[PDB]
């Protein structure tokens, strides 16, 4: 969620 | 021997990511100006630990070949290294980046933040053993990269793909220990020996949680 956002941006 | 131009490009690229990463002034000023109490000391640590998660993801994103890994393995590598990478960074800050009073004030804050003595004493024994190695910024940047790209992590589907990314970093680190410490030929084995000490923090941290921030809750539980 917050990890995937920060990872994929 | 000396680092090849290929390894120099790999080191510069790691340092480009690691050296840009700093603790914000708003947090640094909070260590010296905020009220001293178990609740407020704990709050500063939450703000600090939260900031590290953003720092970890940003550093990991730039590690050559990390973005080419399976999405599920990318999350597992981050979750598996979150605690270890934080204490390794904490060791760097507690032994170096401190003016005159921050070092002693933060130690007092960590000791009086409501964390049990059985978790506190191993932290400072680790900080003191790491401080005796007299590591450089290059060694800290590489050890963090080696901690993150650990193929031995739980629930990793493609461990060999992680091994491929880690091996060039262990080789750069091995060459750095021979050059900057030729009088101590066992320095490399000592750096890796401190990693087994770092790994014991994982069970300590899990125990501490059973006894925050939306970002901390996701990376932990
Ligand atoms: C270069 C910039 O690096 C960073 O962004 C960065 C580095 C290190 C840290 N460190 C910490 O947050 C931290 C913690 C502890 N000590 N400690 C520490 C900080 C500075 C020096 C020495 C030690 C113990 C409690 N844990 S915790 O996760 O259990 C916790 C969380 C909440 C309540 S309790 C956290 C933060 C950011």
From TrEMBL, chain A:
UniProt superkingdom: Eukaryota
Cellular location(s): Nucleus
Role this protein plays: Nuclear receptor coactivator that directly binds nuclear receptors and stimulates the transcriptional activities in a hormone-dependent fashion. Involved in the coactivation of different nuclear receptors, such as for steroids (PGR, GR and ER), retinoids (RXRs), thyroid hormone (TRs) and prostanoids (PPARs). Also involved in coactivation mediated by STAT3, STAT5A, STAT5B and STAT6 transcription factors. Displays histone acetyltransferase activity toward H3 and H4; the relevance of such activity remains however unclear.
Family note: Belongs to the SRC/p160 nuclear receptor coactivator family.
Protein name: Nuclear receptor coactivator
Source organism of this protein record: Homo sapiens
């Amino acid at each position: 969620q917050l990890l995937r956002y920060l990872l994929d941006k | 021997m000396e680092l090849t131009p290929d390894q120099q490009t790999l080191l510069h690229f790691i340092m480009d990511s690691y050296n840009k990463q700093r603790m914000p002034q708003e947090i640094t000023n909070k260590i010296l100006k905020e009220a001293f109490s178990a609740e407020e000391n704990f709050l500063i640590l939450t703000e600090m630990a939260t900031n590290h998660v953003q720092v970890l993801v940003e550093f990991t994103k730039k590690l050559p070949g990390f973005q080419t890994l399976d999405h599920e393995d990318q999350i597992a590598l981050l979750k598996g290294s979150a605690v270890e990478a934080m204490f390794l960074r904490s060791a760097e800050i507690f032994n170096k980046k401190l003016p005159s009073g921050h070092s002693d004030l933060l130690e007092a804050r960590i000791r009086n933040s409501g964390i049990s003595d059985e978790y506190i004493t191993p932290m400072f024994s680790f900080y003191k053993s790491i401080g005796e190695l007299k590591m450089t910024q290059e060694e800290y940047a590489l050890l963090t990269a080696i901690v993150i790209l650990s193929p031995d992590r739980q629930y990793i589907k493609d461990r060999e793909a992680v091994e491929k990314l880690q091996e060039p970093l262990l080789d750069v680190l091995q060459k750095l220990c021979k050059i900057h410490q030729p009088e101590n030929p066992q320095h490399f084995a000592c750096l890796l020996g401190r990693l087994t000490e770092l790994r014991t923090f994982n069970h300590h941290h899990a125990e501490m949680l059973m006894s925050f921030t939306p970002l901390l809750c996701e990376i932990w539980d």
